[PDB]
Amino acid sequence: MVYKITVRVYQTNPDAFFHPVEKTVWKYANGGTWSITDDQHVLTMGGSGTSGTLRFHADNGESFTATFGVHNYKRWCDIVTNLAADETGMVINQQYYSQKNREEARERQLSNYQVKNAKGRNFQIVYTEAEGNDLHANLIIG
Amino acid sequence: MVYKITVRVYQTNPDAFFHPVEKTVWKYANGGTWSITDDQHVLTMGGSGTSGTLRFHADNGESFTATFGVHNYKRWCDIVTNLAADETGMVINQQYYSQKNREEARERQLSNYQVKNAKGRNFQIVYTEAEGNDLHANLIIG
């Protein structure tokens, strides 16, 4: 059955402004689509076992990836900060199915995750609808 | 050596409606960003030698990828209409730097390319500004 993850982005700090610069979809479970409905990023997936990655960028150099997916019928999420120049969104998205620490993050099936970058800025994902096929999550930027 | 490719999408046939469902950026040349300015898709790249893939999807089931980038200081593009169910945009984008047939398609440095899918719908990419670091291309859907 189709899984959908609707993401709302909350920027709370005026000292920086992030905007999406990359939207990727993993190939498993017949892939999926990244779309927009009323300023909401909607990830529609063909089933459980795949994911999608949003990469954001602020004009001050700061950047992070926010990956949302469904592993064994349960939602998961992870945030990667301090990205290298050759660490684009498609690079990160694939790592959750090849790189050990990333695979463990997905297998944790978190309804919420929190991490900071080197500058101290906090990034959080919180699933407000954390069960079923219609998932909703807030992306909160500190 | 920063390159920018501005893409304008033209849909000419009311029997279908396509919309972007994936925007990827290849990791080479310090990667880059996919952005939006006045309904135009803007691919900014840190240098020559990388690319970005836009995957489009119609509600009838039709899909294709339009990849734009710079190879050897000249613009290039390619359209893939025979998307496998496990071939998302990030899959296609990487193949231009791993699969020989896609490598050759990139190294041809096309500023103009036309191709159809199995249903007979035509897809076209034309660079109206095919010179310099500020490149401009039309994506015309038949």
Residue numbers in the entry:
A (entry chain A), B (entry chain B): 0 to 141
Question: How does the study describe this entry?
Answer:
Sclerotium rolfsii lectin (SRL) is a cell wall-associated developmental–stage specific lectin secreted from the soil–born pathogenic fungus. SRL displays a clear specificity for TF and its substituted glycan structures. In the current study we report two recombinant variants SSR1 and SSR2, generated by the deliberate changes of the amino acids incorporated at particular sites of SRL by the synthetic gene construct method based on the complete amino acid sequence of SRL. Interestingly, SSR1 and SSR2 the two different variants of SRL, differ in their glycan specificity.
In case of SSR2 amino acids at the 1st, 14th, 34th, 113th and 123rd were replaced with Val, Asp, Ser, Gln and Gln, respectively. The crystal structures of SSR1 and SSR2 lectins in their free form were determined at 1.7 Å and 1.6 Å resolution, respectively. Like SRL there are two protein molecules (named mol A and mol B) in the crystallographic asymmetric unit of both variants related by a non-crystallographic two-fold symmetry. The mutations of SSR1 (N14D, E113Q, E123Q) and SSR2 (T1V, N14D, T34S, E113Q, E123Q) were all identified and all atoms of the mutated residues were well defined within the electron density map. A bound MPD molecule was found in both variants at the same place like in SRL while in the SSR2 structure two additional molecules form the crystallization medium were found bound (MPD and a 2-amino-2-hydroxymethyl-propane-1,3 diol). In the structure of SSR2 the mutated residues Val1 and Ser34 are located in strands S1 and S2, respectively. In the SSR2 structure the T1V mutation leads to a shift of the residue by 0.6–1.0 Å (depending on the atoms) while the T34S mutation does not cause any conformational change on this residue. The adoption of this conformation of Asn81 in SSR1 is made possible by a shift of the entire loop encompassing residues 81–86 by 3.0 Å on average, from their positions in the SRL structure. This shift is less profound in the SSR2 structure (1.0 Å on average) and does not lead to a change in the conformation of the side chain of Asn81 which maintains a similar conformation to that of the SRL structure. The carbohydrate binding property of SSR2 remains unaltered compared to SRL.
